[PDB]
Write a protein that binds this ligand. Structure first.
Ligand SMILES: *[C@@H]1O[C@H](CO)[C@@H](O)[C@H](O)[C@H]1O
Length: 628
């Protein structure tokens, strides 16, 4: 295995003796050289555990590092100042000052020029993080909402140009907002240049995807493969016009990239460097679970998958230190947490808390949520959770069956109930969601629908507004970076005409991806409307989170409320949070509150509450008590 000093002299070999002496004395090389010495051993070690003694490893590594230097040299100085800042402040993600938001540029603002006009609103809401959905070129028609990339360099013409994106990112930075986008790396479209060339037999793009001659290997892999979209195709394979079969974990038009080929890592690390120099602060690493395949296994969460992410991390620590990663792993809780590490993905989605928030709204019992917050919330140093209520995706009931079994709950039967409840197929249900990917072969099903539709705002349930304020309060105060699905702050309902659209009809996720509702946003300052009650309710919680230091960090200690309907947790041994998940008044007795001080100020309602007597919480009431 080669060292950092050796490879650095090979990088400088492209320069003539006269200009080489000039680069060695420059500030850009002094920083790159320091970061190479510190972070290259990790890059070498991770790439070695995956590729081993591959002939292509050394030539790939040298090509990658040469490209990494050119990328850091070309990098803007304003971005180099953010590199220095975050290199010396790894806990910026754990700060209570951070509140995030997510939206589709076309649905929320039309185009990129329209999005920069929406920036004063993001500042009004108090956002310091903005996640933009797939901006790059995708095929016309079905593209999985932009998740089938045809070109990582060209922006979708309907949204604008590559220059318009640089202007948006710079305008976000001036407003004190971090730019977050997707790094669609597990797969590309079947219309991508690499895809067409690999299938055509071009030797430069050989083994870039997993192409098989018949059903022999696909049948053997399918014995252990989980179906993500069973409505589209069985297993994880799709057929071409010539008779060959290709690995398609998702849609038929989304072909899985082959990370067993060292050249695919290089190709994708080059695409990462491009995104880094645009000014992107955090990259969303979707489908991190599927980047490595092996016969006999589920081809999910394999050791080499984690090692490849850690290798990508090292490329960033060397050529763009400001670029952090956000893991999206909608898998078993034991596997979700393994992607989170300072040397892997610094932040990651929290599907467990999210799914259990909805479960608790259905059952009215906090048992599962309490268990999750007590045993699975705390993370290692320099890492944070991305807590959310809703996303562009469906809700999967990804709680642990083993955790549920300890509480006397059968995982299969509980998911049967939750799915029936949330799609309005259970008596007295307030939820108005629609099914997504019902698999008759497994009994598994996911739920589509906005936060407002699932709490009952569509039929004007009087408890609906309070339910949204309750779910968001947990995401905003548990510890981690909260991500608001833009449109939820005004109670936006489902898109009614998704089902009668040929390009959207086979994907129920479009029910929860509606356009910017002008009418609801114009009612945001009116306390008499549902939209105004939700906005002012959420805005108050955001204001309190950002100004009060008691919410700092990602750590928590749960509090036993002795009431199965009320959740309780303590932040920094100074903030006691209570959340009633029942539609009836619930009580935390004087007995349970004996250790707490006599009086405590509530940050939600503003009243001074006595804890020396019985505390009765109103239907879906949230209380943030200052106990120190
Ligand atoms: C992550 O990626 C999958 C496949 O591209 C997409 O369907 C999901 O919506 C996205 O979050």
């Amino acid at each position: 295995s080669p060292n950092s000093q050796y490879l650095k002299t090979r990088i400088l070999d492209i320069y003539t003796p006269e200009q080489r002496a000039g680069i060695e004395k420059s500030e850009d090389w002094r920083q790159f050289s320091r970061r190479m010495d510190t972070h290259f051993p990790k890059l070498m070690n991770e790439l070695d555990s995956v590729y081993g003694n591959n002939e292509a490893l050394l030539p790939m590594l040298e090509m990658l590092l040469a490209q990494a230097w050119q990328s850091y040299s070309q990098r803007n100085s304003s971005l180099k100042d953010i590199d220095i800042a975050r290199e010396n402040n790894p806990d910026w993600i754990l700060s209570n000052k951070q509140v995030g938001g997510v939206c589709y540029v076309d649905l929320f603002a039309g185009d990129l020029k329209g999005l920069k006009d929406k920036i004063p609103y993001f500042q009004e809401l108090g956002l310091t993080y903005l996640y933009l959905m797939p901006l790059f070129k995708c095929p016309e028609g079905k593209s999985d909402g932009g998740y089938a990339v045809s070109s990582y360099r060209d922006v979708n013409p309907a949204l604008g140009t590559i220059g318009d994106l640089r202007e948006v990112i710079a305008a976000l930075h001036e407003a004190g907002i971090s730019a977050v986008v997707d790094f669609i790396f597990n797969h590309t479209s079947n219309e991508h240049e690499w895809a067409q060339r690999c299938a055509a037999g071009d030797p430069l793009f050989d083994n870039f995807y997993y192409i098989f001659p018949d059903r022999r290997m696909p049948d053997q892999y399918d014995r252990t493969l989980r179906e993500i979209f069973p409505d589209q195709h069985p297993g994880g394979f799709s057929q071409l016009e010539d008779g060959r079969w290709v690995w398609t974990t998702f849609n038929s038009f989304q072909w899985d990239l082959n990370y067993s080929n060292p050249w695919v890592f290089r190709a994708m690390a080059g695409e990462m460097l491009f995104l880094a120099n645009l000014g992107v602060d955090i990259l969303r690493m979707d489908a991190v679970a599927f980047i490595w395949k092996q016969m006999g296994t589920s081809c999910e969460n394999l050791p080499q998958a984690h090692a490849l992410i850690r290798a990508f991390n090292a490329v960033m620590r060397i050529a763009a230190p400001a670029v952090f990663f956000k893991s999206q792993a909608i898998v078993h809780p034991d596997q979700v947490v393994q992607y989170i590490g300072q040397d892997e993905c610094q932040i990651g989605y929290n599907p467990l808390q999210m799914a259990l928030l909805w479960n608790t709204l259905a059952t009215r019992e906090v048992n599962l949520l309490h268990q999750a917050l007590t045993y699975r919330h705390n993370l290692p140093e320099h890492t944070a959770w991305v807590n959310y209520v809703r996303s562009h995706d469906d809700i999967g009931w990804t709680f642990a069956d083993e955790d549920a079994a300890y509480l006397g709950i059968s995982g299969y039967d509980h998911r049967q109930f939750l799915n029936r409840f949330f799609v309005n197929r259970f008596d007295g249900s307030f939820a108005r969601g629609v099914p997504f990917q019902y698999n008759p072969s497994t009994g598994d099903c996911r739920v589509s629908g906005t936060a407002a539709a699932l709490v009952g705002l569509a039929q004007d349930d009087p408890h609906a507004v309070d339910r949204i304020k309750l779910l968001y309060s947990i995401a905003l105060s548990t510890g981690g970076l909260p991500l608001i699905y833009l449109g939820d702050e005004v109670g936006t309902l489902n898109d009614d005409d998704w089902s009668q659209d040929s390009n959207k009809s086979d994907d129920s996720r479009w029910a929860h991806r509606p356009r910017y509702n002008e009418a609801l946003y114009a009612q945001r300052n009116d306390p008499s409307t549902a939209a105004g009650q939700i906005y002012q309710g959420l805005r108050h919680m955001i204001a309190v989170r950002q100004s009060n230091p008691r919410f700092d960090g990602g750590r928590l200690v749960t509090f036993n409320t002795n009431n199965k309907h009320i959740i309780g947790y303590i932040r920094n041994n100074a903030l006691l949070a209570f959340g009633n998940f029942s539609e009836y008044p619930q009580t935390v007795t004087a007995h349970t509150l004996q250790a707490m001080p006599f009086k405590a100020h509530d940050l939600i309602g503003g009243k001074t509450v006595s804890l020396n007597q019985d505390l009765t919480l109103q239907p879906y009431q949230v209380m943030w008590l200052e106990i120190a």
